[PDB]
From a paper:
Parkinson’s disease (PD) is a neurodegenerative disorder characterized by the presence of Lewy bodies (LB) and Lewy neurites (LN). Spillantini et al. (1997) identified fibrils formed by the presynaptic protein [name] (α-Syn, 140 residues, ~14 kD) as the main component of these human brain inclusions. In vivo studies investigating α-Syn aggregation demonstrated that activation of the inflammasome and more specifically caspase-1, the enzymatic component of the inflammasome, leads to the production of an α-Syn fragment truncated at aspartic acid 121 (D121). This C-terminally-truncated α-Syn form (α-Syn(1-121)) aggregates more rapidly than full-length α-Syn (including disease-associated mutants), and its production is associated with cell toxicity.
Here, we report the atomic structure of α-Syn(1-121) fibrils determined by cryo-electron microscopy (cryo-EM). Helical image processing of recorded cryo-EM movies produced a 3D reconstruction of the α-Syn(1-121) fibril at an overall resolution of 3.4 Å. The quality of the EM map allowed an atomic model of the region between residues L38 and V95 to be built. The β-strands β2-β7 wind around a hydrophobic intra-molecular core composed of only alanine and valine residues and one isoleucine (i.e. V48, V49, V52, A53, V55, V63, A69, V70, V71, V74, A76, V77, A78, I88, A89, A90, A91). The less well defined β1 and β8 strands are attached to the core, while the first 37 N-terminal residues and the last ~20 C-terminal residues of α-Syn(1-121) are not visible in the 3D reconstruction, indicating a disordered structure in line with quenched hydrogen/deuterium exchange – solution-state NMR (H/D exchange NMR) and limited proteolysis, which showed these terminal segments to be unprotected in nature. Two β-sheets (one from each protofilament) interact at the fibril core via a hydrophobic steric zipper-geometry comprised of β-strand β3 (i.e. residues G51-A56). The side chains of residues A53 and V55 form the inter-molecular surface contributing to the interface between the two protofilaments, which is further stabilized by a surface-exposed salt bridge between E57 and H50 that might be sensitive to pH, as an unprotected histidine has a pK of ~6.2. Our 3D map suggests structural contributions of some familial mutations to fibril stability, since H50, G51 and A53 are all involved in the inter-molecular contact between the two β-sheets from adjacent protofilaments at the core of the here studied α-Syn(1-121) fibrils. However, in our cryo-EM structure, S87 faces the outside of the fibril and hence remains accessible for disease-associated modification in α-Syn fibrils. Instead, our cryo-EM structure reveals that the PreNAC is responsible for the interaction between protofilaments, and places the NACore at the very center (i.e.the core) of a single protofilament.
Author numbering:
A (entry chain B), B (entry chain A), C (entry chain H), D (entry chain G), E (entry chain C), F (entry chain I), ...: 38 to 95
The structure:
């Protein structure tokens, strides 16, 4: 006898991550760089939910 | 006897990630670079839910 | 005796990812580059849900 | 005795990905480049759900 | 006899992370660099919930 | 200027495995049952290297 | 200028494993049952290197 | 200028394991049952290196 | 200028393990049951290196 | 200028373990049960190095 049961909104589970010998050089001038986005949820009832964004200027 | 049961909105599960010897050089001037987006959900009731976006200018 | 049961909206599950020795050089000037988009869901009730987008200018 | 049961809207499952020794050089000036789009679903009740888009200008 | 039960809004669980010998040089002048985003949720009832964002200027 | 270089003897690499909802009942009396053999190498300089073997009697 | 370089004897690497909702009943009387063999190497200079073996009797 | 370099004998690396809701009943009388063998190497210079073995009797 | 360098004998590294809601009933009478073998190496210069073995009798 | 350098014999490193809500009932009469073997190495210069073994009788 349920009403609104076992709900799941914006969920992540069961994540396993391994990284041995990654080399990662980066060089930038006046930009916007993004790496390394792992295992992120969110909720946004009124708004823009952005992840991994980059605008060199406005 | 359910009402709105076992719902799943915006979900990820059962993720396994391995990365041994990736080399990744990057060079940029006035741009917008994005890598490494792994295992991300979200919800957005009113708005633009963007992931991995890049605008050099506006 | 169900009402709206076992629903699944915007779902990903059962993902396995391996990457041994990928070399990836990138060079950019005033652009918008995107790689590495893995295992992402979302929901968007009112809005533009964009993934892996790139506009050099506006 | 079901009403709206075992529904699946915008789903992906059972994905396996391997990548050994891919070399990938990229060079760009004032463009919009996209690679690496893997295993992404979404829902969009009112809006344009775009994936892997690129507009050099507007 | 439930009313609004077992709800989960903006959740992450079951995360395991390993990193052996990653070298990561970074060089920047007047930009905005982001790496190392792991295992973060949030909720946002009225506002823009952004993660891993970078704007060289405004 | 190599002598015996980049050798690989008895190797496996780049394996990805997914298994969603497999049911597997087994019943046995005085036998020898084997399932679930995944991603195994070995070397054997002097001997019988057997994998997934079953002898009800001797 | 190498002598016996980059050798690899009995190796496994780059393994990713997912298992969601496997049911597995087993029943046995006087047998020998084996499941769940994942990601195992070995070396054996003098002997029988066996994996996943089952002999009801001898 | 190497002599016996970068050797690897009996190795495993880069393993990621996920298991959500596996049910596993087992029943046995006078047998030998084995499950759950994950990520094991070994070396054996003089002897029988066995893994996941089961002999109801001898 | 090496002599016997960077050797690795019987090694495991880069292991990540997740287990959410596994139910596991077991029942036995006069047997030998084994589960849960994770991330174990060994060396054995003179002898039988066995892992996950079960003999109901001898 | 090395002699027997960077050696590694019987090693484990980089282990991460999570376990949320595992139920595990066990019942036994005159047997030998083993679970929960995680992250164990050893060396054995003269002898049998056994892990996770079970003999109901001898």
């Amino acid at each position: 006898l349920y009403v609104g049961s076992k709900t799941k909104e914006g969920v992540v589970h069961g994540v396993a991550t391994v990284a041995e010998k990654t080399k990662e050089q980066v060089t930038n001038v006046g930009g916007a760089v993004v790496t390394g986005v792992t295992a992120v949820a969110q909720k946004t009832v009124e708004g823009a939910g952005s992840i991994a964004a980059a605008t060199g200027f406005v």
